């Protein structure tokens, strides 16, 4: 388990804030606050992680989702982050993400942005 | 919202089976069974959807995650699907996905597959 | 194969992909997009595996269009990465990335991803 | 940006990208990968926006390598899509898709996705 390691507050290269708890049976629960886009304050996130990773120095696979609706705004969109947690002095979660917006069928070719976020326990 | 429309069993183009409950608060919970890769039986999934979508006939944005560990197997990996639900007679969830495996730092450039899954109510 | 790839292809959106595959592994031709900030034909260039596996695998390829021609400039570029699969029902199965020139501030939102399947008839 | 893009670039893995930007929007050159099933230099071709915006935006570009040369054939191709940012920190920021030739049964796992940043300084 990297339950110890994952749980807590993380920061990406944009200044976004990711607060998460890793449960014992593979759950990720928390809130996400984005520094960019059509977003204000905290959004619910849920995800999953590998609770029994390989002990061979490999990272721990995880992922989570945010739907960009809360008590402030609704951006009619959702982001999934897919990546791995890497332990050590400078712990890191390296991710790629997909951000899909609800579109009409004629616009659906342009529904989905892709990008990458690196999270550290210390802000930039 | 699409709570009723989304809740149920979905099948993708590979024969994979998505069983999902959409909650009133925007939650998705259920099980995923992959017909492909290093997987057997059901895996837990959790995700979110837009519980108050646009009414201009847009899709409903959603996403979910599966970590590929259950009682039977552990593939040391996780998939996320990001996409949108389109309701109607031929209801569809159109998704793109990222599958990341735990890797060493030297192999991290090769950690993440990308693909697309289209889910339908009937196989 | 050279001649199997060479020719006119159509995707699920009604776009038109006209390509010649060189013996040197080159792809050259033109792309006409049915959607987005585009009109008329655009130059494309790419590469393909000119000596693929013989075990029934497809043939890897990729190409780029920058969305500038004599009519329009959308300050963006698409790359398609995929594989050609021969046979009665010949297909090129691709995923693509479309990056627009952005400011540094908006760079997180620079790139769309999608998937196009090309066939020999519409 | 033709003079600015033209040159020898290195990514964070130490791969070498030698490119020439043409007047007519062409990119031509060689790529040498520090990782995967690769040896020596491979032909690349691509395109860039030869008349970009004047508003501080980057220059959109992309290129393709097929991983066949005289030394090796990985039966795969990578495309990089990104933008050139001029000036102080001269940078090409890209995302990439690496597709292998696969059987139809394995086509779900045909494509890797990643990100590479290029600078003229070898790290």
UniProtKB/Swiss-Prot annotation, chain B:
Residue ranges annotated as motif Cell attachment site: 48-50
Recite the UniProt keywords alphabetically: Biotin, Secreted, Signal
Q: Which GO terms describe its molecular function?
A: biotin binding
Q: Which parts of the sequence bind biotin?
A: 32, 43, 81, 97, 109
* Locations listed in the record: Secreted
Domain named Avidin-like: residues: 3-123
The main location class comes to: secreted
**GO-annotated cellular components:** extracellular region
Family listed: Belongs to the avidin/streptavidin family.
Its job? The biological function of streptavidin is not known. Forms a strong non-covalent specific complex with biotin (one molecule of biotin per subunit of streptavidin).
Assembly and interactions? Homotetramer.
| Protein name, UniProt field | Streptavidin
Question: What organism does the UniProt record list as the source?
Answer: Streptomyces avidinii
């Amino acid at each position: 388990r990297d339950e110890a390691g994952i749980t807590g507050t993380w920061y990406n290269q944009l200044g976004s804030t990711f607060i998460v708890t890793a449960g014992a049976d593979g759950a990720l629960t928390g809130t996400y606050e984005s520094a960019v886009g059509n977003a204000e304050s905290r959004y619910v996130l849920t995800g999953r992680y590998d609770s029994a990773p390989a002990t061979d120095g490999s990272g721990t696979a995880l992922g989570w989702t945010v739907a960009w609706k809360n008590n402030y705004r609704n951006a009619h969109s959702a982001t999934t982050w897919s990546g791995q947690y890497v332990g050590g002095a400078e712990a890191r979660i390296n991710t790629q993400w997909l951000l899909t917006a609800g579109t009409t069928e004629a616009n659906a070719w342009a529904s989905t942005l892709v990008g990458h976020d690196t999270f550290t326990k210390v802000k930039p």
